[PDB]
A paper describes a structure:
Four new structures of HaPE555 were determined (resolutions: 1.57 Å, 1.67 Å, 1.73 Å and 1.95 Å). The largest peak of HaPE555 (555 A) is by far the most abundant PBP constituting approximately 63% of the overall protein complement (with other HaPE555 spectrotype peaks contributing 8%). All five crystal forms of protein HaPE555 are constructed from continuous filaments of PBPs, which are organized into two-dimensional rafts. The filaments are generated via knobs-into-holes packing but differ in the distances between adjacent molecules along the filament (having either tight or loose interfaces). This packing brings the chromophores of neighboring PBPs closer together increasing the possibility of energy transfer. The bulk antenna proteins, HaPE555 and HaPE560, are densely packed to form a concentrated glass of proteins as evidenced by electron micrographs and FRAP experiments. It is also possible that the rafts of HaPE555 filaments seen in all crystal forms are part of the organizing principle of the antenna architecture. We have shown that HaPE555 and HaPE560 form the bulk of the light harvesting antenna (roughly 6/7 of the PBPs) and capture the highest energy photons. Thus, HaPE555 and HaPE560 have evolved to capture photons that would be otherwise lost by the integral membrane photosystems: they plug a spectral hole.
Numbering used by the authors:
A (entry chain D): 4 to 177
B (entry chain J), D (entry chain A): 1 to 64
C (entry chain B): 5 to 177
The structure:
């Protein structure tokens, strides 16, 4: 449905509403909660990313010292960008109920690229674990400052699913 | 393959069941208030946020 | 930058280099002033959301039926106005004067809000919190984020921007 | 007069003294890294943020 968007030369937007969206919500499990879950990620993308990268640094502040992985704002900004890219591919995996595109368009070759550039794998592992923790926290009403504007209920199955997409990233970059 | 072009799926979810419609925004067929949008965009660098994290990483926010 | 504003043209103006070096001679404390404007605009979203939130939390009737910001549109319009006001204040601080803030934001605004039922007490709380937040950043009293500036005293610019917020408060009281 | 068109001066301040340049962003004359941009823009509604305030207004944030 949105697969055309992934492959189009310029990625112009596709939209799904009305009866086509009714159908879409039937082909993925827990369609309504799933949409709230995707919304939680993308609506909070900035804070998810900045909190996770900040925590990788506060646990290992040599990362912002000379020779460190996010020394200088150019590298810091590139790291924040990558964390958003990864988060966004995870958001799309949760929308679609599978990880084919995350695996193909995000993870395939990424370790090799980080190894060539010297991006520290231990830092990457911590950034991912925090993004995972933050997203699951939102979805399970364990976020402390901001709660989601949803009907109250249990989203544990979607939390486990999105956790598995983050684990695909962590495993690929280990 | 990861293309190295910084492009990622940008998903947007809409719930407009209050009926508040902004001009120019009807992009698919429907009258129930729901829509999902996906585009492929290059994710940009944010110098302001990089500056902030470089300064403020050691502050615990949001009761984390 | 008056051309940008005088006309509805909608086009951006840019100034850099020796041009900006000169412009900074026409306002006091040019460099700290640019840091101060940057702090306002870089944090605009959180300044606005914290101030409108503080509004509601002291008077939660405002989001009950018949309240000033009940429904998403009314809340969104309020957040929008709070950002409009903050941005006119940011422009006053960039330029060192309040002429545009008065002519293009305040002139006629009390009367519009009277017609539409935008309550003055709620506006007063939102402005006071935006003022406190902005001064907090400029004076190193923000607790979750600090500015990336040399350490120094910015009390004079804090008092100047406080005066701009006070022009808004006085207009809308 | 307030034009009731939601338009406000949108100021952007750039400090690019670290030498990091983005393609297509040089809009003024200068090599010292500094630039100020001003444009008049209609300030838009953010329904997601309105929803968030409606849910979350009573939580104190930022050591406020
Ligand atoms: C998106 C911002 C946000 C809102 C809003 C909210 O309500 N919660 C939010 C973020 C959030 N963060 C976490 C978990 C962690 N965040 C960090 C980094 C910070 N801890 C530090 O020590 C540090 C430097 C001083 C930080 C900056 C860490 C380490 C975690 C824990 C990661 C883990 O492996 O568990 C969450 C999850 C819920 C929680 O409160 O812990 C959320 C929602
Ligand atoms: C932009 C967000 C932010 C960051 C980041 C940061 O470091 N400080 C930030 C905001 C900020 N807020 C204030 C002051 C106030 N904020 C509120 C609203 C909240 N108080 C509530 O009771 C409430 C509902 C539960 C809120 C939401 C208020 C009332 C104030 C005080 C205003 C006053 O008259 O003093 C500041 C100023 C410094 C501080 O920590 O108080 C800042 C920087
Ligand atoms: C974990 C994700 C959350 C949690 C989420 C829940 N959402 C529930 C019902 C629900 N959500 C929507 C909006 C959603 N559907 C769409 O099509 C789109 C946009 C395209 C959106 C944003 C709807 C329509 C519904 C049905 C109920 C209603 O409208 O009131 C829900 C109830 C269970 C269920 O219906 O499966 C839950 C639990 N709730 C939580 O507390 C955590 C934080
Ligand atoms: C390198 C990757 C940096 C980074 C640089 C970026 N700057 C972006 C927008 C931008 N920067 C300026 C200032 C520059 N232009 C000039 O004319 C002068 C002085 C004469 C300077 C110092 C301007 C005016 C602009 C906006 C252009 C406009 O409004 O028309 C930018 C954005 C590109 C995008 O959003 O896709 C970038 C990436 N950003 C980083 O994180 C690192 C540290
Ligand atoms: C309250 C405002 C702050 C405080 C700010 C200070 N800034 C100081 C010097 C300074 N800042 C800049 C960047 C600024 N000038 C520009 O043209 C632009 C972009 C267009 C910006 C963002 C510069 C270039 C300078 C001078 C070179 C340098 O000092 O690095 C400063 C020192 C005093 C002075 O120069 O007047 C201060 C105190 N510091 C604080 O602790 C509060 C939070
Ligand atoms: C009324 C003033 C509301 C308000 C509504 C806004 N929606 C905006 C963007 C938007 N909304 C949709 C969903 C809508 N279009 C459809 O085709 C369908 C169903 C088939 C629906 C339910 C879409 C697709 C879009 C994006 C339009 C595009 O991608 O071309 C919007 C603009 C946001 C902005 O300018 O930043 C507004 C203002 N927003 C509010 O706060 C009140 C509550
Ligand atoms: C953040 C948690 C990391 C960190 C990240 C860095 N990545 C750097 C350059 C870079 N990253 C990619 C992968 C990115 N591009 C894509 O197209 C996609 C998926 C579609 C992804 C996820 C590429 C291709 C590149 C280089 C080419 C480019 O940037 O356009 C980077 C700069 C490193 C350097 O120049 O030395 C950083 C800092 N670095 C860290 O320490 C933490 C752990
Ligand atoms: C927020 C702290 C308030 C709150 C504010 C509301 N304002 C509403 C509508 C509105 N606001 C203006 C003034 C605004 N437009 C401009 O062009 C400029 C400056 C250039 C300003 C500051 C106008 C003209 C209007 C009506 C037209 C429109 O919405 O575009 C509003 C909705 C009222 C309505 O729908 O009639 C609200 C809720 N309300 C509160 O309770 C707190 C105190």
């Amino acid at each position: 449905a949105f697969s055309k968007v992934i492959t189009s030369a310029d990625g112009k937007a596709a939209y799904v509403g009305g009866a086509d969206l009714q159908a879409l919500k039937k082909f993925v499990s827990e369609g309504n909660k799933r949409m709230d879950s995707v919304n939680a990620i993308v609506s909070n993308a900035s804070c998810i990313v900045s909190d996770s990268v900040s925590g990788m640094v506060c646990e290992n502040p040599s990362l912002i010292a000379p020779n460190g992985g996010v020394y200088t704002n150019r590298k810091m900004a590139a790291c924040l960008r990558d964390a958003e890219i990864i988060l966004r591919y995870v958001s799309y995996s949760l929308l679609s109920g599978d990880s084919s595109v995350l695996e193909d368009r995000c993870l395939n070759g990424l370790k090799e690229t980080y190894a060539s550039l010297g991006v520290p794998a231990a830092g990457n592992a911590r950034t991912i674990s925090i993004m995972k923790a933050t997203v699951i926290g939102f979805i399970t009403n364990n976020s402390q400052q901001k709660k989601l504007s949803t009907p109250a209920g249990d989203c544990s199955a979607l939390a486990s699913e999105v956790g598995g997409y983050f684990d695909k990233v962590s495993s690929a970059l280990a | 393959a990861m293309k190295k072009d910084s492009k990622a799926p940008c998903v947007e979810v809409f719930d407009e069941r209050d009926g508040c419609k902004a001009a120019g925004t009807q992009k698919a067929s429907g009258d129930d208030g729901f829509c999902v949008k996906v585009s492929m965009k290059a994710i940009g660098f944010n110098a302001a946020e990089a500056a902030s994290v470089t300064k403020n990483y050691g502050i615990k926010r949001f009761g984390a």
